[PDB]
Design a binder for this molecule. Sequence first.
Ligand SMILES: Cc1cc2nc3c(=O)[nH]c(=O)nc-3n(C[C@H](O)[C@H](O)[C@H](O)COP(=O)(O)OP(=O)(O)OC[C@H]3O[C@@H](n4cnc5c(N)ncnc54)[C@H](O)[C@@H]3O)c2cc1C
Ligand SMILES: Cc1cc2nc3c(=O)[nH]c(=O)nc-3n(C[C@H](O)[C@H](O)[C@H](O)COP(=O)(O)OP(=O)(O)OC[C@H]3O[C@@H](n4cnc5c(N)ncnc54)[C@H](O)[C@@H]3O)c2cc1C
Ligand SMILES: CCCCCCCCCCC1=C(C)C(=O)C(OC)=C(OC)C1=O
Ligand SMILES: CCCCCCCCCCC1=C(C)C(=O)C(OC)=C(OC)C1=O
Ligand SMILES: [Au+]
Ligand SMILES: [Au+]
Ligand SMILES: [Au+]
Ligand SMILES: [Au+]
Ligand SMILES: [Au+]
Ligand SMILES: [Au+]
Ligand SMILES: [S]
Ligand SMILES: [S]
Ligand SMILES: [S]
Ligand SMILES: [S]
Ligand SMILES: [S]
Ligand SMILES: [S]
Lengths: 421, 421
Amino acid sequence: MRGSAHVVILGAGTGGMPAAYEMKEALGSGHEVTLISANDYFQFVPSNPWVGVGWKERDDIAFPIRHYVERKGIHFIAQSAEQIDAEAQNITLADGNTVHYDYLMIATGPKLAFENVPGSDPHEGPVQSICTVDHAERAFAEYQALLREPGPIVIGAMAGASCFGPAYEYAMIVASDLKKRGMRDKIPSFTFITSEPYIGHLGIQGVGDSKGILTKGLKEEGIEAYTNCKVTKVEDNKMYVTQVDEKGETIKEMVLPVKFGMMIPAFKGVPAVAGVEGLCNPGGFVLVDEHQRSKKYANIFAAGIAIAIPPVETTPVPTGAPKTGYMIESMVSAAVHNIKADLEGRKGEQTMGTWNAVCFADMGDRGAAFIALPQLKPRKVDVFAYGRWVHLAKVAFEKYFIRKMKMGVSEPFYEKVLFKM
Amino acid sequence: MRGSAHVVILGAGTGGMPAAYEMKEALGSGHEVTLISANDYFQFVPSNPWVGVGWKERDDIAFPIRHYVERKGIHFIAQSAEQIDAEAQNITLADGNTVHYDYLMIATGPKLAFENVPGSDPHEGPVQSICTVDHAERAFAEYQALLREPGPIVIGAMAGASCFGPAYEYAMIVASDLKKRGMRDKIPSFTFITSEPYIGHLGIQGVGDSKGILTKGLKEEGIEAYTNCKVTKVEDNKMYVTQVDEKGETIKEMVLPVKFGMMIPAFKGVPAVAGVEGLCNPGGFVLVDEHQRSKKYANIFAAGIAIAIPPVETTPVPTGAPKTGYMIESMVSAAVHNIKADLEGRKGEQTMGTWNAVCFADMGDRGAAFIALPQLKPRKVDVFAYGRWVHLAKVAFEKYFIRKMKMGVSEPFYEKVLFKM
Ligand SMILES: Cc1cc2nc3c(=O)[nH]c(=O)nc-3n(C[C@H](O)[C@H](O)[C@H](O)COP(=O)(O)OP(=O)(O)OC[C@H]3O[C@@H](n4cnc5c(N)ncnc54)[C@H](O)[C@@H]3O)c2cc1C
Ligand SMILES: Cc1cc2nc3c(=O)[nH]c(=O)nc-3n(C[C@H](O)[C@H](O)[C@H](O)COP(=O)(O)OP(=O)(O)OC[C@H]3O[C@@H](n4cnc5c(N)ncnc54)[C@H](O)[C@@H]3O)c2cc1C
Ligand SMILES: CCCCCCCCCCC1=C(C)C(=O)C(OC)=C(OC)C1=O
Ligand SMILES: CCCCCCCCCCC1=C(C)C(=O)C(OC)=C(OC)C1=O
Ligand SMILES: [Au+]
Ligand SMILES: [Au+]
Ligand SMILES: [Au+]
Ligand SMILES: [Au+]
Ligand SMILES: [Au+]
Ligand SMILES: [Au+]
Ligand SMILES: [S]
Ligand SMILES: [S]
Ligand SMILES: [S]
Ligand SMILES: [S]
Ligand SMILES: [S]
Ligand SMILES: [S]
């Protein structure tokens, strides 16, 4: 509505939740802010690997959204968008209802593209996922089934994956949990399959000594590792893998039996968003400018995994660079600021800032973390760290993030990085 | 003078120079700001090791102070304080002149305590220093003399030292320069002597994997390393060393011939400051509070190496924790803010912030850096990094810092750490 613009935020995840609060905080009581998401609960996704091995419960890492955002004056609709007509600016929900918007802020994260690898969907074979708590709970249940009936383990990342950290994390804690159950010696073979050109490439051409450290780690745990691999199909509990060389030629094909498995899938854009004509690249990722504004529709903004970021390298086997938390927050802040500026007749000039990747993996008593920026080398910061303190930090950050998602944020997010003052 | 208070800044070094500008910027044209220092030039001290091996010239890393601060309205006096009467608030200069102050900001850095080890003064034996460009130039001249007449090399850090980084740096680049001259094989023995309880303790109980990395480094270069060592005397070109165990007992004594040497000395407070009654601890370091204000004299503030920081551990052989650049700047900012507040009838509440150490060592094509905070473990940040990018950063930072010392700072120093926005 004119003068009382209605802003809709699609997706209540790492970018979406904060976007809701920030938007409402910025616009005030004169504008309608509606948050629409497929689930009625928020989940802290960096914790999913731990759920997948049973180190955490769903209840530890998730909570119902409604109360917390409604107490802030945000309208919550727990329904997935099935369709977005950008011309009429209407969104059709799963239940057939439709919602109009004056501005749209898309934060739908990834579609897990299991279909790239026939048989790889967690519901159709032994290869599970820890990308969502629903999947991680299923991974754990299968993990227990491996405990009762031991057989070969296969963990890694598919062709086109962009989130490698968690595969390493999951492989280490599995190994770790297998020992603490005195069950490790009952595993016939524990294999790490990755699409990375080398161990610890991480989709970012490596950070610090991640190659050396992740390699050593997989050896400590007795995990055999293969790089430059694409899984072509999962079938009869066997993983068909092709391994290439620097020039894409095939150097071998393997068939790996799998009693228990977990492969990071490739990410695509969700269907409702990918389905909007001229909105997205062929991956279904929203093409936006420096200001987070759709290049096709001026009243559509995007943040998080949903946006497209051009590649800067090409690997023998296709891989993506990850989109991580601090950068997503920069995107969210910028989108909110610029939408606000639009509502006030200005060109918002705020941008995402410098590309960066930050990731924290907890392996139990200690953890690994990295910070890399910008995307291309030589970087301004290229750090890989390991220690008990990385563990303590992950723990503290999750405690913090979840609290903030309940109390609300205003909130130039990341006064966390102010533990100096 | 009443209403036109006169602020004097003693020492034009890493804290002192910025303090001068910041002070003047903060107080404005209504107050006299005078900067007093022993040298008429500013020097970027982190570059001294490179001068010491001849990779840099004095002219690359130093410049005359007067013009640059006078163009800002700051009075410059190139004379050392010989005496400070805190009662009368007068400072006596080397030439016998005296200067009155309403507020005193002490930034005199360290007295290099060669006297702790008889014979160790660079003017009385083969053991040189790279702490100042004057000394580093002398180190280099002796280095050349070693080239013409090869013999044993000894590099390290004395008992009571608090700046270890640069010893490692200097040892590596010496080794490095020896190879590039095809002269390394002409060295009979290259020994690293340190007061640290172990390699890469760095006076901070280690950071990340500094133990493993510095150890490996000294092996690559063929340098034999001894920890828990105190030098007792230098005499007849021989270094008399005592090595202790965890419990301070002696486990051996060595006599090492030295053709070329460089040991980081212990730091004490300069005489003029240490000489002020009740001002300092027995080391001659100014006892200040959280706000950088002397605990004895309310109109005396201090920043930089000049202040006392209580130890948090005790090593078999006495060692200190380093006081590094970013923390010194926090000290300076706080002192300036709180002096300003005093001039305006408020209690300044600003503090140094969290204790931290940050250090960058360039070894030529690549460098090592670390960040640790706070002082005690487990830390919130405990990182040790190595790579070409650390080199690129040191280079960029020096270029930047020196520029800022000429243009002036206002200047909530460290918008450098804003290469995100
Ligand atoms: C296992 C795991 C570990 C990770 N570890 C880290 C880490 O250590 N540090 C880091 O910085 N990053 C981490 N990431 C990367 C990144 O931070 C997360 O993936 C993050 O959650 C992405 O946030 P988002 O807002 O883009 O997407 P999401 O958090 O996935 O949120 C998208 C939301 O949109 C909803 N949605 C989707 N489709 C629709 C639809 N059609 N209609 C309505 N709602 C819809 C979903 O339900 C979801 O709530 C991790 C990623 C994963 C998977
Ligand atoms: C070789 C070397 C490498 C270092 N590397 C790093 C690094 O990588 N990163 C980092 O953060 N820190 C580094 N440091 C540590 C620290 O940052 C420096 O020592 C820094 O210069 C200390 O600043 P300051 O202001 O306390 O003392 P200084 O820079 O030493 O300045 C003190 C000033 O006071 C003057 N003065 C002394 N006595 C008198 C007197 N009686 N009257 C008048 N003037 C006087 C001196 O001439 C000098 O100008 C390094 C230290 C050294 C020695
Ligand atoms: C140079 C930039 C440093 C910023 C990061 C330091 C502290 C926060 C860690 C990053 C992080 C963010 C932002 C984050 O949003 C997130 O949740 C999705 C994490 O998972 C635990 C993160 O690790
Ligand atoms: C967590 C805090 C990080 C701050 C440091 C990042 C960039 C600057 C490096 C620190 C530094 C400072 C402050 C500094 O003042 C200085 O000169 C004495 C250095 O020597 C090169 C430094 O390396
Ligand atoms: Au995933
Ligand atoms: Au990721
Ligand atoms: Au990702
Ligand atoms: Au020194
Ligand atoms: Au130092
Ligand atoms: Au120091
Ligand atoms: S990652
Ligand atoms: S991603
Ligand atoms: S990640
Ligand atoms: S240091
Ligand atoms: S120091
Ligand atoms: S240092």
